[PDB]
Each structure stands twice: as structure tokens, then as C-alpha cells.
Design a protein around this ligand. Structure first.
Ligand SMILES: Nc1nc2c(ncn2[C@@H]2O[C@H](COP(=O)(O)OP(=O)(O)OP(=O)(O)O)[C@@H](O)[C@H]2O)c(=O)[nH]1
Ligand SMILES: Nc1nc2c(ncn2[C@@H]2O[C@H](COP(=O)(O)OP(=O)(O)O)[C@@H](O)[C@H]2O)c(=O)[nH]1
Ligand SMILES: Nc1nc2c(ncn2[C@@H]2O[C@H](COP(=O)(O)OP(=O)(O)O)[C@@H](O)[C@H]2O)c(=O)[nH]1
Lengths: 434, 426, 426
């Protein structure tokens, strides 16, 4: 049937995948050792998109772990989730690229790219309904940028027509770690425009704002930030892993949300995202959280949504939701005038309601709420998020700082110049279409 | 004898019939095994029209179930009345349209059209003389509006003689359902005005307004919205399945209404409609059931009936009724509402009365009207269709499939000539 | 046949009928389910005048219940005989008048007037020939005196032919009930002298004086004060509902009394009225029931009957009575009280006798009189109305709604011409 493959490249690929595949074992009733208990067969209704069958219910994830460094991969090969994954699906590196492009685009990647594309083809030949790709990466990583652009340069030659999905983290304009992240974000945007269907972005700080105010988590780290992103990942798959009245597959997401083949970069949002106590004193209706979707304390990228112009807003609901107030509240959004559209698209809405409510992680900070919304809103606030990063790249480039690492690794300096004219017209097209 | 197949394509029309066959099962006294348990043989003497009995009475519905994915197959199969359908007909693909017309028409629908074409042929070879087809699909989505669009273009090569019922949902002015919803409308109706005989433009929006006021139901289940679509369709074919003082087949419903080979775009109506507690407090007279039929409340589409003119009034009444009171009040509406009719067509009322009511009432009324305010249905979508063609958005999902730009404009000219023809006689 | 709707608006008239329909229910032998349990068909042969039977005999009263808030809805609905009323008619708003005329007339009443206007239309379309309307509301408050005021201004556009019964309570000279009570009187009567046919000025004050002396009741429940309003109204329409030796409809009660198109302001009366223990100790003769009717005690309004003149005496007697003793004593009152009549109108007594008494007695008398001492009812309020206009108080609750100052003075001139017309013939 339909079967979807996931690829995890970089350390952000490692631990986000350590949460998403951890979460899916809860939502299908699969024990982490590798087999299933017999009670979760009725829950296991069309789980075939990720898990091959082996011998007696033993379910390997159709997932590939790619890293140039063996350290964080051994965390998978130490914990409980060691026996779940397949060993020859784990392909490790030895020498690190250290957030450098040609160290991750030519040096260690080209010794390992031929090993992993076989493991792509070894697994994908079982498919008769191969839909899409979950590729997880960063923007400033050596293998996060240098290998990811090269990997998407090769799978479009192989499979082409079949879809792709990229999840990543938007680098914050104020608080971020690596100094080469303004460099590599221009590099990972250069040749991945042509080789990616859609790519999503989240902020470190925009997670933190709801963590401190609504979750009331005043000591967050990369443990709980992986759980919050994984709920957004799981809510997309709920249209596919279960039987809904009006649901949507991966080819349909890009068909609605891509108005032009270059501007295809929306973001995410999730609500209700609060702690376990505040849901007790409040009855969260449909009109409650849907109006909570379109306020700037709910976006997952810290920018100005009111200074952006909405073009195609996508909505996926979960839980037992009636469509009457849905057909009212989205109309009640249209009664408000602050939600600005473009003049040519009034019909940029998507309706999706699944029967299954989201189930929370065990021992987590969330609360069991029936209603939830995964808001996807492509807008022109991405252009205002382009200018904050195009300011960082050029001024460090003008003094030619940190160029002496990019030179000797098999890389040219004129490629920095061509990406400048490439990204200049990109943020222009938000204002040209808008 | 007079035999009709029912074909479902796209996610909309696949679940409409899934509640609709149940009433057809229950009006004739059969079981999910197809076991006849009707007490009177009035439920058996016209059982053959939608069924092919084989090998000790397990009646199979003359139904074809097509999808581009196996998602909607198992839900109907494991759901209610799943054992009744013939597993020979479970033909499907592995793509999914992704709300794309040229995928459903040129790319992916062109593969699966050959398999069910023989299935259309196979059940039509085992009968003496076919009568017409009934088709449930969508016009907003991509599967039924792309694949069921092309199916009518090949029925006329097999059977250029009979009638074609193409029941499909239509967009609403208030809230759009999909993003390419004006694209899926103009390109479909381009083929619907070529080779079809009737479409019933049912708005998703106004069905809640029926349920919110009459039924007062706070929780609209999608089984219940199609249930009001289910009782509409069963009242249309009551003459072919039941006797009475005046019988009227689908061709008589066709020939009385459509005046010109394009204007066949009709909206349906049904009375009585109310909640539970208002049963005894109103009257079950001919007069009370009359004025409900001619209200904006009973308009299943969200168009205003006092912004148009009724051309052909079809009154399919169900139940033991007095003919003269039907003859009384159908005169009386034109003595009241002569502005609400077209003027140059005299005697706008067509009346067909079967003496059998549906299960659950004592006297019912199945209305199908022709208001020229349905011109505004194609006014509102022709602007939304030309809202995005002026900026050439989403062209890489159609030209990337291989669609012509003139395929838009040829449909766009024929869309605008359509509202000129309602304007011709209004 | 001859059909009459009963409409209630404002908190006063909503609870008057709530005990009044009970007697109408009990005089004709029906139940809160509407189940007819009358033993003799005399209680059935004119049941149609206030009812529309539908679907196995659950009679619904031809009643419309309007409020600006849902407060008075549920109390009537959950109270006694709550299951009898049709839930189609439960039309209401969400404002509350707050004792403001221009809210009830211009601001908030203008919204809810459209919904029940079709409800006035709907029950009048299902009949052959309407007869007239009866309306219970207030003149002191804000809801009924503001919204029911405007309703009569739109009945004449629908039906400029029939009669209009506008029963409403009036202010008393002793203790005012609300603060803007002279404002709610002059502005209402400005519209009441334009398009109405009868008003019964019932004082809230003198109803206790009836209960304190005759009934001797120490605890006046508001169910009991409207109970004396209930038996007054049922005796008026006894001819249309029961046979007898002389029948007299509401139009005959109209045409005999009103001499000029303004002077139709009548006070009612009822006899016998006493407590429990004085039953056997008095006499049930024509002579004892006569002189009770012409006492200041029986004056339901607090005006002095020997400070005016009876113009038209309406004697609606109920019970098996001797006609000659009625013919005897109605002569004898004018041989006693010739000063108490107008002089130039001969034979001031109008007599209508139905041979059916109300339930609970053996012989009763329903009196409606026309004293010209009701001139003092509009003398006392025209000074209180002009008590606060001289200081322009509370103008920011009316001009803030958008009321004209000339709207006061145009009503104020027509208020003072009204008492000149009682002065014309006194
Ligand atoms: N929040 C979060 N961010 C991560 C995590 N892992 C990596 N990142 C992001 O990845 C960016 C840089 O990429 P890295 O993961 O450090 O390097 P890489 O992708 O493994 O590529 P190499 O240099 O070849 O090792 C940083 O800016 C981080 O924000 C993680 O576990 N949690
Ligand atoms: N009433 C009702 N309408 C539905 C249901 N499912 C889909 N629809 C309608 O069908 C339209 C979408 O068409 P669909 O067949 O689902 O897309 P497709 O599969 O690509 O052809 C929408 O406008 C929905 O309103 C349902 O269960 N009930
Ligand atoms: N007998 C009786 N009179 C009432 C009752 N309720 C209100 N009234 C009279 O109604 C008058 C007030 O009018 P009302 O309708 O309450 O004010 P509104 O709602 O603003 O129109 C007062 O003079 C009261 O005497 C009741 O239950 N019984």
C-alpha cells in the first residue's frame, strides 16, 4: 500500500527523530523492543506507511539515520530504542564537518553518499505506493546544509515525481550559536529551491514564549522542545495513519499550499498548547482555539504576522469536532478584518477534520485535550524574515571574514556571489505577487 | 427491465451512497445479506431495477465503487452494509488525485478508466434494454471532478440514447472548501454542459441552515447531511419502484423540465422537515406541506428563490392524498406568485403522485425546481475562477501536468454564455 | 370560520392570558395536551374560534407570545398549561425595554416586529375570513407599551377592515407604579386614538378594593387578580362560543357603544362578587344582581360613577334567566337614575343574553359601561405628563434614543382634545 520513508541527517535529524518515532510507538501501541502487543491490533489500523512486517509483528521503521559523527548515534545504540531500528539502516560517519559547507558537501559526504542511496533503493523497492520523504535537517550544519543540498540533488534524479517534505529550524536573528549560520543559510537556500517541494521553519524563541507563559516551563531544554515539534509532525500524519471523514495526503498539501514554485515556504502553529492545570478552569471550544490560531503569541516563527499577508492558510483539526461551527468560525475570522489576504486569493482555505484527538506523551508537560489545530499559514512575513538574515550575511562577507575555511575544502568563492542575486529576487517576489 | 446502474467516484460521492443504499435497502425489505424480509410483495415487484438476483436471493446492488486510493474502500467495506456489495466491482488505483483535475483526467484517471469501462459494459450486457445512469461525485475535489468528468465522455460512445444523472455538490458563496475549488468548477461544467442531462447543485452551506432551523441539530454528523441527500434521491425514482394513480419515469421528469439543451441545472427540495418535538403541534394538510416547498428555507442550495423565476415546478408527492386539494393549491400558488414564475410558459406545475409515502412519515413532498436565480451560482464562481487566472497562480500544477491555457479560456467563454441564457428569458 | 388571534406583549399581558387561557381551556373541556374531555358537545361545536386542530385533536391555542427577554418565556413554559402552546410562536429578543418607549418602538422593537409579522400573517392565511384581533399588553411599562403600540400601526396595513381589542392596564391616581408612567401613557394613547377600536381601562388600585370588600382576601396573589380579569374577558365572547336566545358578536358590542371614532374607552364590570361564607345569605335574583352592577364597588377602575353619565349600558347576562325581569329592571334603572345617563340618547340599555352561565355560578352578569367620568382618567395623567416636561427631566433617555420634543406636544394637544369630547355631551 502507501509507504513513506524518513531520512534523518544531522544532529537535529537525530533527536527530533528520537521523539517522533518515540511518539508513534504510543499512538499505535507498539512496544519499543520491536514487536507489538496483541491488544493493539485494533488500534493498528492502516499503520503500514512506516513499518514493515517481519516474522511475527516485528516492525522496523522505514527510517534512515545519517550522521558524520558517531557520538549521538550511540545514544540510540544505548537506550531502549536500540532494538527497534535496523542496523544497516544506521550508516555512521567518523570525521566531523564542523558546520562547514564543503566539508559536508564534498569531504566526508562523498565517501558515504553511495552507501546510503543504496539503502534508500533497498527499502523503496518494496513500495507500490511510495508517497513522500521526511528529511530532517538544519540550516547551519555541515551535513545539515552541505550534504542535505547534495542529497536532494540526487533523489530528484532517481524518483522525481514523488513528493518530499523538509522540517528544519529557522535561525533566530538575536539568539543563535554558530557564527557561520548566516553563511550556510544562504548556501542551503541556493540549490534547494529547485530540489525541494516544501520546507518548514520554526524558531527556538517562539517555542520558548509558549513554554514560559502557557506551559509554565521555566527550565526547558532540548528534551521538551523535541516533544512540541513532534506533535506538529504527528498531526500531519493523522490524516494518513487513520480513517477520517475529510482528510488529505501529501501530494494534496503541496497542491494547495504552493501558489508559485519558488515561494513554497510556510510555517506551523499549534493550539491549545498550555500546561495541565489551566485546561481545568476553561472549556476550550472550536471558536476558542481557532481564534487563538491567528494571534502573534501562537506562531512558531518569531516574526510579525500582521505585517505579513496571508495567501493560503491550511487547517487540520483533530478530535471530535462538528463542521457547523467550523463553517462559522472560519467565516467569523472573515468577519474580522485584521486577517489580510491578497486581492486575487479569497479561496485559499483547506478543511481537514480527523476523528482521533491528540494523545499526550507519558510523563510530559502537556494535557489531554480533544481539540487541537495544526495551523499552516504561508504569508509575506517570511520576506521580513528574509531581510533580517540577508543583513547578517553580506556585511560579514564584505570584510571576507571566515573565508579561509571555505577555500581549501574544494569550494569556490563566486558561488557566494551567485546566491546573493538568487536570494535578492526571492524576497522581491513576496512583494511582486503581493 | 428498465435498468439503472449507480456509479460513485471521488471521496464525496462514495460516502453519499453509503447511507443512500441503506434507505433503498430498507424501503424494499432486504438485509445486508440481501435476504428479502418484506412482508408485502409491494416491496418485491420492482426490486429488479437496482439489483441482480443470483444464487438463492442474495441481491447485489448494481453499483460500481471507484477510488484512486484504497482509503475509502475499506471504510465502506468494513462499515454498515459492507457485505452487500459485490467484490467484483472493487476497482481502484494507488495514486490519489491530490485535488488536481489533469491528474484525474489526463494523468492518473486515464489508467483506471479502462478497467471499469468493461464493468459498465458487463452489467449492461446482461439486461434487455438499459434506461439511464445515475452518478454521484464531486465538483470541488479532484478525484470525482477529474475522473467522473471523463466517464460521461465515454458513456455516449457506448450509449448515445439514454439519460445521465450527474448528482454532485457545488461551491458556496460564504466559505470555500478547497483552494482550487473555482478551478474544479469551470473545468468540470465545461464537460457537464456537453454531454449531461441533469445536475443537482446542492450547497454544503445551506444544508446546515436546513439542520439548524428545522432539525435544530447542534452536532451535524456527515451521516446525517447525506441522509437528507438520501431521502431526496429516493423520492425521485418512486414511480419506477412503486405503483400509483400517476406514474412518471426519469425521462418524463427530464422532458417536462429542460427547455433548451443547456438549461438543466435544477435545485431539489423536500417537505416535511422539522425536529422531534414539533410533530403534533403543526398540521399534516396539503396546505401546510405546500407553502413549506416554496420557502427560502427549503432551498437546499444557498440561492435566493425570490431573486429568480420558477420555470418548471415538479411536485413528486408521496402518500395517500386527495387529488383535488393538490389540484386546488397548485393553481393557488400561481394566483399568488405570478411574478415568481416565468410569464410566457403557462401552467408551470407538473404533478406526479405515487400513493406510497417514505418510511417515517404519512405524507411527504419531493420538490425539484428551476429557478433562474441559479444564474448567480455561475456568476459567483466565474469571478473566483477569473480571480486567480489574472495572476496565473497554480499554473505549475496544471501545465506541469500538461494543461492548455486555452482550455481555461474556452471554458471561460462557455461559462459566461451560460448565464446569458438564463438572462434570455428572465 | 370567524377567527380571532390573541397576542401578548410585555410582562403584564404575558401573565394575564396565562391564567385566562386556563378558564377558556376549562369552559370547553380540554386538557394541557389539548385532549377534548367535554361530556356534552356544546363545549365542542364552537371550539374552532380560538384553536387550530391538527393531527389527532391536540388543539393549539391561536396565540402569539412575544417578549424582549427570555425571562417570561420559561415561566409560562414550565408553569401551568405549558405543554399546550405551539413552540413555533415562541419568538423573542435579547434586549429588555428597560421601561423606554423609543427602545420598544424605534430601537429594539423595530427588530423583532418583522418576525411575528409573518406569524400574524401565517395563521391568518389558513382561515377563510378573519374577524378581529384581541391584544393584552401594558400602558405603564416599556415593553408592551412600546412594542405593542407599534403592532397596531401595522395590522391596519394588512387588515384595514376588522376590529382591534387592545386590553391594557392603566395608571391609578393614588400610587404610581413606575417612574416614567405618565410618559408611557400619553405617548401610547397618541397611537391608541389613531387605529384602535376599544380599550378597557382597568386600574390596578381598585382591583384590591374589589378583593378587600367582596372577596375579603388578605393575601392578593397575582394569579387571583388576573383571575378577575380572566372571567371578565370570557363573558364578552360568550355569544361566539355558545348559543342562546340572543347572540351578539364583538362587532355588535362595538357598533352599539362607540358614538364617535375617539370615544371608545370603556370600563368593565362583573357580578356576582363576594367571599365564601356569604353564599346562602343573599339572593340570586335578577334584582340583587342588578344593583350590584351599578355600584361604585363594581367599578373595576378607580373612577367615581356618580361623577359621570352612562351613555351605552351593555348587559351581557349569563345563565338561564327570565327575559321579562331583565326587561323589567333595565327600565327601572332609568326611572331611578335619569340624571346618571346622558339625556339626548334614549334607551341606553343594550341587552345580550346567552343561556349558559360561567363555571362556578348559576347566574352571572358581565357589564361594560361608558361613564363620562373616565374623562378624569385623562385629566389626572395629563397633569403628571406635564409635571416633568416643564423641567425637561428624563429627556436623555428619549432624545438619546432619538425622540422629538414635538412628539410630546403633538400627543399633548391630542390628549387635551380628548377630554373636550367627553365635555361636548356631558
Ligand atoms: N533545537 C535543536 N537544534 C539542533 C539540534 N541539533 C542540531 N541543531 C541545530 O543545528 C544547527 C547546526 O547544525 P548541526 O546539527 O550542529 O551540525 P550537523 O547538522 O550535524 O552538520 P555537521 O556540521 O556536518 O555535523 C544548530 O544551529 C542547531 O540549532 C537539536 O538537537 N535541537
Ligand atoms: N456532506 C458531506 N460532504 C462531503 C463528505 N466528504 C466530502 N464531502 C464534500 O466533497 C467535496 C470534496 O470532494 P472530494 O471527493 O472529497 O475530493 P476528491 O476525492 O479529490 O474528488 C467537499 O466540498 C466536501 O464538502 C461527507 O462525508 N459528507
Ligand atoms: N394582576 C397582575 N398585574 C400585573 C402582574 N404583573 C404585572 N402587572 C401589572 O403590569 C403593570 C406593569 O407593566 P409591565 O408589563 O410589568 O411593565 P413592562 O414589562 O415594562 O411593559 C403594573 O401596573 C402591574 O400592575 C401580575 O402578575 N398580575
Amino acid at each position: 500500500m502507501r509507504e513513506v520513508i524518513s531520512i534523518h541527517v544531522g544532529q537535529a535529524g537525530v533527536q527530533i527523530g528520537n521523539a517522533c518515532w518515540e511518539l508513534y510507538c504510543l499512538e499505535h501501541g507498539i512496544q519499543p523492543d520491536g514487536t507489538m502487543p496483541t491488544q493493539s491490533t485494533n488500534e493498528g489500523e492502516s499503520f503500514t506507511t512506516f513499518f514493515s512486517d517481519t516474522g511475527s509483528g516485528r516492525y522496523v521503521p522505514r527510517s534512515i539515520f545519517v550522521d558524520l559523527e558517531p557520538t549521538v548515534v550511540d545514544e540510540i545504540r544505548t537506550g531502549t530504542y536500540k532494538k527497534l531500528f535496523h542496523p544497516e539502516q544506521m550508516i555512521t560517519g567518523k570525521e566531523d564537518a564542523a558546520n562547514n559547507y564543503a566539508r559536508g558537501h564534498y569531504t566526508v559526504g562523498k565517501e558515504l553518499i553511495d552507501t546510503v542511496l543504496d539503502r534508500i533503493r533497498r527499502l523503496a523497492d518494496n513500495c507500490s505506493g511510495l508517497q513522500g520523504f521526511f528529511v530532517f535537517h538544519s540550516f547551519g550544519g555541515g551535513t545539515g546544509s552541505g550534504f542535505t543540498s547534495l542529497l536532494m540533488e540526487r533523489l530528484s534524479v532517481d524518483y522525481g515525481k514523488k513528493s518530499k517534505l523538509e522540517f528544519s529550524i529557522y535561525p533566530a536573528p538575536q539568539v543563535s550559536t554558530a557564527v557561520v549560520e548566516p553563511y550556510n543559510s544562504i548556501l542551503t537556500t541556493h540549490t534547494t529551491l529547485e530540489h525541494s517541494d516544501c520546507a518548514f521553519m520554526v524558531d527556538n524563541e517562539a517555542i520558548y514564549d509558549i513554554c514560559r507563559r502557557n506551559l509554565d516551563v521555566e527550565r526547558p531544554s532540548y528534551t521538551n522542545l523535541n516533544r512540541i515539534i513532534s506533535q506538529v509532525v504527528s498531526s500531519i500524519t493523522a490524516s494518513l495513519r487513520f480513517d477520517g471523514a475529510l482528510n488529505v495526503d501529501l501530494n494534496e498539501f503541496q497542491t494547495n499550499l504552493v501558489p508559485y514554485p519558488r515561494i513554497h515556504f510556510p510555517l506551523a502553529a499549534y493550539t491549545p498548547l498550555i500546561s495541565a492545570e489551566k485546561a481545568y478552569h476553561e472549556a476550550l471550544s472550536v471558536s476558542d482555539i481557532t481564534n487563538s490560531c491567528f494571534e502573534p503569541a501562537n506562531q512558531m516563527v518569531k516574526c510579525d504576522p500582521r505585517h505579513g499577508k496571508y495567501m493560503a492558510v491550511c487547517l487540520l483539526y483533530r478530535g471530535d469536532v462538528v463542521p457547523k461551527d467550523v463553517n462559522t468560525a472560519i467565516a467569523a475570522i472573515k468577519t474580522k478584518r485584521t486577517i489580510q489576504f491578497v486581492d486575487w486569493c479569497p479561496t485559499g482555505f483547506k478543511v481537514g477534520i480527523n476523528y482521533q484527538p491528540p494523545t499526550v506523551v507519558p510523563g510530559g508537560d502537556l494535557a489531554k485535550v480533544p481539540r487541537a489545530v495544526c495551523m499552516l499559514s504561508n504569508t509575506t512575513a517570511i520576506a521580513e524574515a528574509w531581510s533580517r538574515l540577508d543583513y547578517k550575511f553580506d556585511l560579514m562577507y564584505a570584510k571576507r571574514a571566515f573565508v579561509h575555511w571555505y577555500v581549501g575544502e574544494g569550494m569556490e568563492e563566486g558561488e557566494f556571489t551567485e546566491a546573493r542575486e538568487d536570494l535578492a529576487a526571492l524576497e522581491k517576489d513576496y512583494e511582486e505577487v503581493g | 427491465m428498465r435498468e439503472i446502474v449507480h456509479v460513485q467516484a471521488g471521496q464525496c460521492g462514495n460516502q453519499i451512497g453509503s447511507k443512500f443504499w441503506e434507505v433503498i435497502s430498507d424501503e424494499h425489505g432486504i438485509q445486508p445479506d440481501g435476504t428479502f424480509k418484506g412482508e408485502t410483495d409491494l416491496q418485491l415487484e420492482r426490486i429488479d431495477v437496482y439489483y441482480n438476483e443470483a444464487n438463492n436471493g442474495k441481491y447485489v446492488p448494481r453499483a460500481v465503487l471507484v477510488d484512486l486510493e484504497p482509503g475509502t474502500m475499506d471504510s465502506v467495506r468494513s462499515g454498515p452494509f459492507g457485505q452487500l456489495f459485490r467484490p467484483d466491482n472493487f476497482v481502484f488505483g494507488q495514486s490519489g488525485a491530490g485535488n488536481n483535475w489533469a491528474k484525474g483526467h489526463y494523468t492518473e484517471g486515464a489508467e483506471l478508466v479502462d478497467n471499469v469501462l468493461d464493468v459498465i459494459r458487463k452489467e449492461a450486457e446482461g439486461c434487455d434494454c438499459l434506461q439511464g445512469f445515475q452518478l454521484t461525485h464531486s465538483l470541488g475535489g479532484g478525484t470525482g471532478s477529474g475522473m467522473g468528468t471523463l466517464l460521461i465522455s465515454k458513456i455516449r460512445e457506448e450509449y448515445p440514447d439514454r439519460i445521465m444523472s450527474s448528482f454532485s455538490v457545488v461551491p458556496s458563496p460564504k466559505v470555500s472548501d478547497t483552494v482550487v475549488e473555482p478551478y474544479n468548477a469551470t473545468l468540470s461544467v465545461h464537460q457537464l454542459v456537453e454531454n449531461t442531462d441533469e445536475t443537482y447543485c446542492i450547497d454544503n452551506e445551506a444544508l446546515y441552515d436546513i439542520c439548524y432551523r428545522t432539525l435544530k441539530l447542534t452536532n451535524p454528523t456527515y451521516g446525517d447531511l447525506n441522509h437528507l441527500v438520501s431521502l431526496t434521491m429516493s423520492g425521485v425514482t418512486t414511480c419506477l419502484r412503486f405503483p400509483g394513480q400517476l406514474n412518471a419515469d426519469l425521462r418524463k421528469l427530464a422532458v417536462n423540465m429542460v427547455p433548451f439543451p443547456r438549461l438543466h441545472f435544477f435545485m431539489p427540495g423536500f417537505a416535511p422537515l422539522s425536529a422531534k418535538g414539533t410533530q403534533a403541534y403543526r398540521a399534516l394538510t396539503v396546505a401546510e406541506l405546500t407553502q413549506q416547498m416554496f420557502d427560502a428555507k427549503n432551498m437546499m442550495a444557498a440561492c435566493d428563490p425570490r431573486h429568480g423565476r420558477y420555470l418548471t415546478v415538479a411536485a413528486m408527492f408521496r402518500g395517500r392524498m386527495s387529488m383535488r386539494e393538490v389540484d386546488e393549491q397548485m393553481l393557488n400558488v400561481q394566483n399568488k406568485n405570478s411574478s415568481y414564475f416565468v410569464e410566457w410558459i403557462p401552467n408551470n406545475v407538473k404533478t406526479a403522485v405515487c400513493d406510497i409515502p417514505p418510511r417515517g412519515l404519512k405524507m411527504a413532498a419531493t420538490f425539484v425546481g428551476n429557478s433562474t436565480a441559479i444564474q448567480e451560482l455561475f456568476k459567483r464562481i466565474s469571478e473566483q475562477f477569473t480571480a486567480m487566472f489574472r495572476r496565473k497562480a497554480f499554473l505549475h500544477w496544471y501545465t506541469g501536468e500538461g494543461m492548455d491555457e486555452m482550455e481555461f479560456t474556452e471554458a471561460e467563454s462557455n461559462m459566461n454564455d451560460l448565464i446569458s441564457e438564463y438572462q434570455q428569458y428572465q
